[PDB]
Amino acid sequence: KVFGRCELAAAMKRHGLDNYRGYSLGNWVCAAKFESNFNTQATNRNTDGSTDYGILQINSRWWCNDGRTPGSRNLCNIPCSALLSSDITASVNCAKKIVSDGNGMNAWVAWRNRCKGTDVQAWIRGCRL
Ligand SMILES: [Cl-]
Ligand SMILES: [Cl-]
Ligand SMILES: [Cl-]
Ligand SMILES: [Cl-]
Ligand SMILES: [Cl-]
Ligand code: NA
Structure with missing residues (x-):
């Protein structure tokens, strides 16, 4: 599914991510x-052979099981x-x-490189939340 911007904002908020660990929506x-x-x-495949999955590109090295990442963990206990x-x-x-x-x-390199320190409220501007 390709979410719309405000659609995803609303779903993330309903699932409790807004201000989670202090990180605004x-x-x-x-x-x-x-x-x-x-x-x-x-x-997306990583150079180390792990793979990133889904809307937040969560990495099979630590967080999920994909059966093809040697030596990895599955700390979220999910496929x-x-x-x-x-x-x-x-x-x-x-x-x-x-x-x-x-x-x-900072676990998300792209958040650090492209979102951190920016006007992130622009991403929810106009959304019915
Ligand atoms: Cl957009
Ligand atoms: Cl923090
Ligand atoms: Cl594996
Ligand atoms: Cl599994
Ligand atoms: Cl925000
Ligand atoms: Na894994």
Whole structure:
């Protein structure tokens, strides 16, 4: 599913991400924009052989099981395919664990490089929330 901007903002808020660990909703929308262009089916292989999955490009090295990432963990206790669903529940619940891991949203390199320090409220501007 390719979400609309405000559609995704509303779904993330309903799933409790708004201000989660202090990160306002626009941070999460901005991260999803640059990780996946709001496409739940996005996948991308990493140089180390792991793969990133879903709207927030969650990595099989630590967070989900895809059966082909040697030496990895599955700390969200989910198949990586669950992160591709039209229902964002699994991606949200896993993102909550990731963002609590110590480095906050810096875990998402694209958030650090493209969202951090910017006017992230622009990502939710105009949305009925
Ligand atoms: Cl957009
Ligand atoms: Cl915001
Ligand atoms: Cl594996
Ligand atoms: Cl599995
Ligand atoms: Cl933080
Ligand atoms: Na894994």
